[PDB]
Amino acid sequence: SRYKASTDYAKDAEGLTAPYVSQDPQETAALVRALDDAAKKGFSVKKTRYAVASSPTGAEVDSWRFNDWDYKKPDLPTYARGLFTTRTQHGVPEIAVRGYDKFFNIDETRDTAWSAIRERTKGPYELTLMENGCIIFISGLEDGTLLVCSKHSTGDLSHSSAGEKHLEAQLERIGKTKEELARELRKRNATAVAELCDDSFEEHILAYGPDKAGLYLHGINLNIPEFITYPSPLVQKFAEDWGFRKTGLIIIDNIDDVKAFLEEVAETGAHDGRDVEGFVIRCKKSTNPGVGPYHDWFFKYKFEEPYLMYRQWRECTKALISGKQPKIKKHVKITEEYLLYARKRLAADPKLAKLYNQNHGIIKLRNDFLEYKNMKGTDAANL
Ligand SMILES: Nc1ncnc2c1ncn2[C@@H]1O[C@H](COP(=O)(O)OP(=O)(O)OP(=O)(O)O)[C@@H](O)[C@H]1O
Ligand SMILES: [Mn+2]
Ligand SMILES: [Mn+2]
């Protein structure tokens, strides 16, 4: 529309002030108590302990994974998606890593029905581009160690190490170190939340060539049981200061404009000339509208097409490579032709199957077929 994803916000961020809330050891220990009771099953959580290989005090961290069901229940001790717990060298219990609260796509839950959002949220609405990769958490442990995790893990080429290597490069580029980053993040009591996007490491659906590749900072959260997240202009500033790639942002005051905007982009699945997987919308939510305490609250707007078709193509090719039956659920006749074109490309280049299995060549194979068909991915999806 007349709206533009932008990355020049970081300079209005000087008027704003980062939120800060310290950790209450008592609060944290009760949260861990309740988490361990849920791990002692017989809501349900699963706990995994990891060493922190570069921690000079041998810190360990405990990752808590809920299944997506439990987040729709009331009365959970926390709603973090991605949560890591620890004891410092002095025995203090702490949240080492806190992700976003599990958030949901439009119409996926009662709260993410458009009518529910109109009623129970207030603006302004932060429209943050949804980069297509894997989530990466970064924080600073008490002994100065820079902790890098994937959504539920941190050992070793794991996603978390690939994320860390990328962080090492960006910090080298700006002449800063991990230890300075760890001190800054602990100073803020915060987890940095980034999307790792690199076709050379792993392909997803949209492309990320050698430029464009790296860690896209889209969030900073307070390491506390409750959900408090930085406003996105403050995130973009932190990205600049610490060498992250920034996540594009639109701010729309009115919620009816948000719906119309998101629907317009959804016709193409593209915005400002670039393909876009979706938006994550950030605002304040009330238990019941009118007044009430407002807390931070996200919802997803994941554009259905042509990305569903691309995803079906990905899974159908893997099923072709493996011996399993390709699941054709949508875009029937064009997927018929895609699967025949793929079979021929595999016959003429037998090593593709191994590569495709390891998530290299997904995007190229799709784009080659669309070339052969002389179509844009959008029109192929619209058949
Ligand atoms: N601007 C953004 N704001 C929030 N999340 C983003 C953003 N851009 C990309 N993401 C990624 O989107 C994910 C949520 O959308 P997606 O549909 O990929 O969910 P998912 O991978 O099934 O994970 P979950 O089960 O945690 O929802 C986050 O885990 C995060 O890695
Ligand atoms: Mn999920
Ligand atoms: Mn994703």
Q: For the chain, list the domains and their CATH numbers.
A: 9-302 (3.30.470.30), 307-382 (no CATH)
Q: Work out which ligand 1 atom sits closest to the CA atom of 128.
A: 1
Which numbered atom of ligand 1 lies nearest the CA of 105?
A: 17
| Separation of alpha carbons 160 and 25, rounded Å | 27
Closest CA to 43 of 20, 3, 71, 81: 71
Asked, as a colleague might, if the bond just before 124 is cis with ω within 30 of 0, I would say: yes
Query: What CA–CA distances, in Å, run from 285 to 35, 288, 298, 331?
Result: 26, 8, 9, 37
Residue 264 sits at φ, ψ, to 5 deg, of -60, -50
User: Residue 251 to residues 4, 5, 127, 349: CA-CA distances in angstroms?
Assistant: 9, 9, 6, 47
Method underlying the structure: X-ray
Structure tokens at 377: 């991915």
Distance separating alpha carbons of residues 367 and 361, to the nearest angstrom: 10
Is the separation of the CB atoms in 127 and 252 below 8 Å?
yes
Q: How many angstroms separate the alpha carbon of residue 365 from the centre of ligand 2?
A: 26
Q: If you count them, how many residues does the chain have?
A: 383
Q: What is the resolution of this structure in A?
A: 2.5
Please enumerate in sequence order all residues whose Cβ is within 8 A of that of 205, keeping only pairs 6 or more positions apart, or say none: 132, 277, 307, 310, 311, 314, 362, 363
Atom 31 of ligand 1 has which residue's CA nearest to it?
135
**Cβ of 126 less than 6 Å from ligand 1:** no
Measured in angstroms, how far is the CA atom of residue 167 from the centroid of ligand 3? 20
Burial string for 135-150 (b: 16+ CB within 10 Å, else e) reads bbbbbbbbbbbbbbbb
Q: Which ligand 1 atom minimizes the distance to the CA of 282? A: 3
Nearest to 332 by CA among 279, 264, 260, 383: 383
Q: Is 214 exposed, middle or buried (0-12, 13-18, 19+ CB in 10 A)?
A: buried
Q: Which of 105, 280, 300, 311 to mutate to test the pocket of ligand 1 (most atoms within 8 A of CB)?
A: 280
